[PDB]
Structures are given as structure tokens and as C-alpha cells.
């Protein structure tokens, strides 16, 4: 049978203490939901390893071997009834062995063999195999030597064996240390975004978590048509030499040269190779070889290198300071001594001085500026095209498709190139024909998901890729991102942002959830399913032009609305020297070699927490004196109740401010007892307290009720509120009496928008999305720069301790340096994005200035700065790190349709509205004013005369009363 | 000479180690010297 292993077999990975942490690690792990092979005692494979459990005692040891008889060592770990009993020797008695270990419900082992030693793991739990996790301990490793290819168990009838699989586990730790819980980060999408952002809980969006990739399948070889084999019997077994001032040259070409004759032996003294290594020049294709072969005495073969002095290699034989060749010389005649200047490289000239006794020749290289030549025995293959493929044309390897070519080629040239130097075009050595090479399919991969606790599905996003290609790829199995329990669907769509794998096309427009990119959205609608549409960008409607109707409002209400403001963010000081060094001195003075890195770096840091605290400032220090909050909260019917604070609390907030403080949801040294930690990083605390802010926004809230909008500019001067109101009414263009009459109206409007502004708060939306945007991107610049502190940069080990207290001073040097210049480097990456998010910070917190000056202490004129509608009044509440407006304005709403005039003429004389309209009745002409529906009678009180009836275009005729 | 441009293609390098100081035509018109 079959069945299948869910959430079993976890171990712990290493012997430290762990708690309260998610901690990424990459081992041999069980896959979750694979496949065991139930047993109800056959030699079973052991490949990288296993797992053993048994439900039943009955069945006791193992067998791990290699050929299971009496001719390779075999290891027994065997229980008789009292004594675990390790042995390892040539089992069928027993023979030539080498070790001895003897010492005094479901069980559940992980056998595992590595580097010599079988580590042993054991679980044990009290009940077909069941559907828990359960974690397991180590036992013991030994140090046997063998290979263990196959085992079998030892009974005296059912156990289940799985395979261990390399894999990246995450693991949750307890508050006490073990672990809880843990996900398979290749084994969904889900589970690899799990991975990506560290958590197990997923909110909705749309997330970048990885890069896919298009593996190869062929392997194409072309070299070109070299039979000849190459002639180093005549060059290097010679009989005669010529002398160091005469030495000749001889070109080699249109051979197959093997180059193993010269390292394979140790005929030669000296093997010296420049730009290349003996070993590689089996595999390139050189155009032609040129051999210089000359006689030496013993200690100036040293002189013949590249940049030498002395007499050989400067009046004899120079070698250019570009040199790519190798030079020989063995144990086995005159030189030039005197001449006129210098030798220019390769050059000879034909005051000779006569001479161990060393025989020389240089070999040089010329690379493929020309059809090669002589190259070595690689063997050729058909080539393939349209097709994922790594390639080999003369020695110039890749990886990319093949695909016929419209290129015209010079007949000296082989191959084509592009501006960053990659070769884009071959010629091919045998058919001559002209190949263009392309990249493989690559891109990124975006996880789209409903958030992880509405649904378990999600849909992929494979960017800026047509998806046959990934189609094809994923029915092959070639993608580099290959997740096990995944299956592609007939859901694929084709976009352009790439294309979508899981998500289905629907006709109908919706307003835009998650966006994907070019017009096309994703939501969750109705089961529920991940749905794909085009976005709609408005509701649509009609409004008929017509040259003799007017519309004009015949109601009203007052709505308050919010905004979110964010103003400042947390002050940061870091210890340069305690984040770099910590307590060593070695890397003090090492440090030191630097200049004024940390006194700068501390100075950057200095002056964007004196930013900070400059914002709040400006934005809340804004009033002269400070007016206290009335007794009674009741002005004319205006229930000021929830925006003032209350005297029978311990607290300075108001309710409304209680409700946003509690919305936001807010390591590092800070204190308030004094903590610290090793890594040098602390939160200063700001100059102005939460009391102070909450003081500063309950005077502006009672100077506002109390005086109004005088303060802003002088003294403050009481008005009562009814008036006040009059008076806001009169500034947006409607007359007073229209407040007067409807005074107990426009409270009631009020008051019950205050209420709905406190529940939709209740009610637990993110409006405060903007506050919390700022605690997140400080804590995740924060964790970076903690975590850069776990890479080496190269050294040996990212512990300054560990390599201070195993190696000497001289080697301590170089992996100090290395870690030096990888966290000066990482604390420069945080101090230039500090310095960029300060100044976003710093104009959010100028416009919030702006708007507490214009908007609080005035009433605007200027359109949808301070809500939607006319402004009339608008007042401040402190939030963590900011401050929200609730502005109250006016909205006309409800309708009428008229039938209006520019003028009327009543005599000979055009009469023209003062301020209004005139409107039709459907009986009578009245005039009124534009936004509110009042009509008064036609008099010469609201009317002006100016001019003759004969020039105005639609000019009526009515009466005018006196 | 013509005033134009023209472009010229390699035919070949010869791997012969002597220095070029000074040179001369050999004949049986005119022709033109410039300097790189
Ligand atoms: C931790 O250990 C204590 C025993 O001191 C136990 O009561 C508790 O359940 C354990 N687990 C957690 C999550 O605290
Ligand atoms: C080339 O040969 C001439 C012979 O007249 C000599 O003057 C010159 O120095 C030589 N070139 C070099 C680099 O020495
Ligand atoms: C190389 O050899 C192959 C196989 O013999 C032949 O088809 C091809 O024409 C040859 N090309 C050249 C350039 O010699
Ligand atoms: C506006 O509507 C309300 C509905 O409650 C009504 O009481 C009020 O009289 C209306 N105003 C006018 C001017 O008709
Ligand atoms: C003002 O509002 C508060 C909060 O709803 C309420 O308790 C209080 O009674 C109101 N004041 C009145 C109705 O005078
Ligand atoms: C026109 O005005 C008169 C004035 O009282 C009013 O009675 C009548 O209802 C108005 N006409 C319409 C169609 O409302
Ligand atoms: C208004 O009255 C004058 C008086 O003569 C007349 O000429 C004119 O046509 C009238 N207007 C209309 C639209 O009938």
C-alpha cells in the first residue's frame, strides 16, 4: 500500500537554545505530504537517507549495508530486550572489523548519513499511520566509514518508511523552546510567501516573493573539422637548439592537440602558464600556436617571464607585459651583451658573449581572432534549435536558444557582439551558418491572495513572459521554482503584465481591488473564487445641456469627514563602534584607519532627530495662550461631548482620541527600568509628551467654540455659537436666516455625524492606514540592519569572538577587514535611506501645518482642501505620530428643475439680478439665490438697470413692483 | 588624391620578429605617404 506522510518527521536541527522565534534553516527534511510505503522484510533502498516508524514489541534493530553479504562492512544496531548493541563488521560469525558499541505506541527514527557519521534521531507518541506533528530528539551519530545503500529491518509486521529530500523548513519556536509548529516552503505558493515575509498570517495583496527560471534540456558541441594530429614530438624532442639571440619561431596549425603529454610527467623543471591553467587547454580552440625554442644557462630562466631584467629579456628575448601562453624549460651557444637601446616584445636582432645548461620553448596563444585551429578532442554533436540548450561553439560556452539568423557577416569574422559584451550572433563552423543566440524564459513571480484567513488559494503572476512557454515548461518540468503539490489548471490567462495561472476571466467591470497591471484587477466574489476583470473607472450618468433650465438645491446636510496626516517618525541613535567592533580593540585600531565615519554617520543621524521634533512643533505649537475646556459642552444644541475631554478621568484624551490610540498597534534598546542590547541600537524619546500634544488639541478645540475664528489673528473675542454658525453660513453664500430658522435641524445633522464618526472608528476599519505605514517601514529598516549582521562578507565566520579566539594575529587581520568593510557598507545603506524618508516625512508634516493655519483657525475658500463640499468648521485630534482633521462642511442635495432668464425688461430698461438667479415658479417670476431654494418677489431693491432690452440674447418680458 | 572616405579590410599578419625602421617602393603615376 501507499499512504501518506502529513506534518511528520520534523527534528531539531542543531543543540542551541531557541524561543520565541521563526528561524529559517536548510537540511534533509521529510516533505510534508509525500508518499511512504506501508509494510504489512525486502531489502529497501536508503538514499539520502530515511524514515523508519512502527506502529507496533515485534520489530527491534536494523540492518545498513552495501551489498549485504560477506564482502563490504555492514553496521547491526540491534535490542536484546535490555541492551542497545552497535557492531559493524562483515556479517553473513563475523570478521575484519572496526567498531563495538554496547550500553544499557508509535516510535518514530530519522536515520541520516553524512561525512562519515549516522546521525540517529528518535520521536516517541501514544496512539494506518496517523495525521499529527510531532518533533524528534537526537540519539547518537557514530563514526563508521561506509557507504549504507540499502537496510532491512530485523523482527522477531508494520512499519512505514518515507525518504528525506533537501528542503527549507521554517520553524516556530516556543516561549519555553521547543518547537510547535513549522511550513514547507516548497510545497504551495502560500507556503513559499509564508516563507518570504516571515510570518504565518497573510494579509491581501499582491506580494513579489521569488524569480522563475527556464532550465536547460539539450547540450549542443560544435567544433570544427580537425583530423591531423599535432606535431610536439618534432618541436620539443629535437637535436639541435639555436642560441638565445637567435632564437626561432614555429606556427602550428590544423591539428588536434592533446596538451596532456606536458603535465602528465615531471620531465620539465619549470611549468609556468600566464592567463590560462594547465589544465583548462583540453577544452578551448586556439587559432594557431607559435613556439619559441631557444637554449638558456640555469639562473636566468627566472629572467624569462613577463617584465624581467638583466641581459636575456633585455637585449635578447622580451616577453610582452599581456602575455597569455606558458613557458617550459628541462635540464639539458652565445648572447648578446652590448647593444644600442632596449628590445621592443617578440622582436630579435641578428658584442656576443659565449655561455647548468637549460633547454627553453614559450608557447603563445592566438585567440580566435580567426576560424580556430588547433583544438583539443571534444567531440561534436547535431544542434538544436528553438530549444533551451547550453552550447559550446569553439570553446565559447553559454546557455539560451538557437534560432537561424538574417545577420550578414564579413568573411573574417565569427562572431557578433552588443554594447555590454555579450555575443549575440555565431557562426557555426561546420554548415557556416549564422545562429542569433536568446536568453531562456526568466522574470519574477507574484503571489495574489485574499488574505490567510478567508481562503487557502491564491493565483500566480508570471511576469513579462508569453505562457506557452511557461505552460509547456510546467508540463515538462523545467521551472526552477518547482513546487511539488501544485497544478497548473485550465484557468491560465494571457495579460500584459506577464501572465495569470489560477484566477478566472469574468465580463462584468468592477471597481479595482488588487491591481495586476494594464486595466486588470483581481477581488474575491462569488463558493468564492479568485476572479480577473477589467477595471471600472466611474458610475456613469447623463446630465442634459439645455440653453433654459437651471437646477437648483431645495435641502441640505452637514457631513464630517477625516484625514490622516502623519507628522513625525522614532528618533535612532546607533554606537558605531559597538554595531562594527562591540569590545574587541584589535578592531578598534583597525577601524581607525577609516577617517570620520562614525562621528559623520552620528551627526546624520543627530540632525534627523531635531527634525522630527521641529515637525511636531510647527504643526501643534500654533496658538499664544491657552484657553480652558468649558464646564458645560452644549452650544445651542451642538454636543461638543466627545471632542473635549472629561473631568471625571484619569486621562487628557478625549474619547474619540482614545479610539484612535488604541487603533494603531505599535529588538533595540529603549526604556521609560534601562535595557540594552549587543548590538548597539537605541530609540531616543521625543520632547513633547502625548499630555502636551492632547493639551495643545484641546485648546485649539475650546478656543474654537469659545471664540471662534478672532485668534488666529490678535486677541480672541467671544461670540456665541448660533452666531458663529451665521456667520460660516454667510461665508459660503447662503443668508443667515437660513441657519436661524433651521438652527435645530443643523444640530441634530451634527450631532448624529459626530456619532457615526465615532462608531465607523469602533468598528475597527484601517483608516489609520498611513500611521501604521510609517511603524512598519521603521521597525523592517530596523530588522535589516540587525539581520546584516549574521553574513560573513567572506571571512571564516561572522563572530568576531570566534575568530579572535582561534587564529593568530596575522590572519585575524584580513577576515577583521572583511567584516569591517561589509558593515560599514550596511550601516551607510541605512543612514541614506533614513536621510530620503525623513524628507517625505518633513513635507507631510509642512502640509498639515498648512492645513491646521487654514482650516482650523479660518474657514477656506479653496476647493476639496478641507473636506468635500463648503467648508464651514473643522477641528484637530492627536493620533500616534500624527493628527486627523475632522472637517465638517456642506453638501446641497436634493434637486429641482426651472426654467431661467439673464434679464427681463420692463419699460424700455434691462433689469439684471443682484445676487441670484430668476427662476420660473410655473406660475410666476421669482428671484433666488443659487445654492438654497428661497424665492422672493421681483423688486427694484434686488435688481440693477443697465442699458436697453434690445442687445441681451433672451431677454423676457414681467413686471417690475416699486 | 580623391576626398573621400573608404574603408579598408585586413588581409594579413605575418609573425616576423625584425624592427621597420625605414622602407621603399619598388617599380618598373605617383604615390601618396601618410603617417599613423
Ligand atoms: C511551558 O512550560 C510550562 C511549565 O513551566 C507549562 O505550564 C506551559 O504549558 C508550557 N508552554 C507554554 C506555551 O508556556
Ligand atoms: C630598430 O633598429 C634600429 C637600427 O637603425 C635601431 O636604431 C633601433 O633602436 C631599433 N629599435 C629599437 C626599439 O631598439
Ligand atoms: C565538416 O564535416 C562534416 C561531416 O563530414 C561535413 O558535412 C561538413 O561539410 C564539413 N565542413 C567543413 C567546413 O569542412
Ligand atoms: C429638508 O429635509 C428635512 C427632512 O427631515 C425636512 O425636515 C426639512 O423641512 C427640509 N427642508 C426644507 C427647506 O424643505
Ligand atoms: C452629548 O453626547 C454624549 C455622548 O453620546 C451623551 O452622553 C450626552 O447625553 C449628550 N448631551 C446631551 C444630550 O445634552
Ligand atoms: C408658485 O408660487 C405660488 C405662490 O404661493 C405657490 O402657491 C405655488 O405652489 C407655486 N407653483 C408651484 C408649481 O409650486
Ligand atoms: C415684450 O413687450 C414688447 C412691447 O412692445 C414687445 O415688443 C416684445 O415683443 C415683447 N417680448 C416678447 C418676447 O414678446
Known sequence: TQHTSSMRGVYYPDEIFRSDTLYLTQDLFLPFYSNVTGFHNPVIPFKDGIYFAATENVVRGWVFGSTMNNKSQ????????????????????????????????????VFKNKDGFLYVYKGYQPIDLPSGFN????????????????????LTAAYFVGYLKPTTFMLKYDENGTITD??????????????????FEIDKGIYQTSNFRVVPSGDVVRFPNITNLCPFGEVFNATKFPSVYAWERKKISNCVADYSVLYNSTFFSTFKCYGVSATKLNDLCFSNVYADSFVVKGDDVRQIAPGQTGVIADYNYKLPDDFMGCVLAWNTYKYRYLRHGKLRPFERDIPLNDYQPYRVVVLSFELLNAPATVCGPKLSTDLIKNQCVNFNFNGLTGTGVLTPSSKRFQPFQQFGRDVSDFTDSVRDPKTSEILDISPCSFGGVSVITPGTNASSEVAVLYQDVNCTDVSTAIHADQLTPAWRIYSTGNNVFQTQAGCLIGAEHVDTSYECDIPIGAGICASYHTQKSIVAYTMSLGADSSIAYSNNTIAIPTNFSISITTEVMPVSMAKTSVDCNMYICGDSTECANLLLQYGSFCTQLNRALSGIAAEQDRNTREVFAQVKQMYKTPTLKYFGGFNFSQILPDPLKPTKRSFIEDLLFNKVTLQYGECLICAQKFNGLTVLPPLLTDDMIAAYTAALVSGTATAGWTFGAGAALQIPFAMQMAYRFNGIGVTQNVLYENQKQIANQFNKAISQIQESLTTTSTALGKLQDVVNQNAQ??????????????????????????????????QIDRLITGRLQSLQTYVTQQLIRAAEIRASANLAATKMSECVLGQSKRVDFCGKGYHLMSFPQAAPHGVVFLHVTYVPSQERNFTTAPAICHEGKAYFPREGVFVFNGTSWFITQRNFFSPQIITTDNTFVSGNCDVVIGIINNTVYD
Open 135 to 154: 518533533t524528534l530528539k537526537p540519539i547518537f551519530k557514530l563514526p563508521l566509514g561506509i557507504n549504507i545503500t540499502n537496510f532491512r529491518a530485523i
Open 74 to 109: 555492514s553496521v547491526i544496531i540491534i535490542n536484546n530486550s535490555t541492551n542497545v548493541v552497535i557492531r559493524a563488521c562483515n556479517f553473513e560469525n563475523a570478521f575484519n572489523c572496526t567498531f563495538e558499541y554496547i550500553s544499557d505506541h508509535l516510535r518514530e527514527f
Open 182 to 199: 513549522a511550513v514547507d516552503c516548497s510545497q504551495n505558493p502560500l507556503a513559499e510567501l509564508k516563507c518570504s515575509v516571515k510570518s
Open 781 to 814: 529598516a530596523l530588522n535589516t540592519l540587525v539581520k546584516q549582521l549574521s553574513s560573513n562578507f567572506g571571512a571564516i565566520s561572522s563572530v568576531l569572538n570566534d575568530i579572535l579566539s582561534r587564529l593568530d594575529k596575522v590572519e585575524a587581520e584580513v
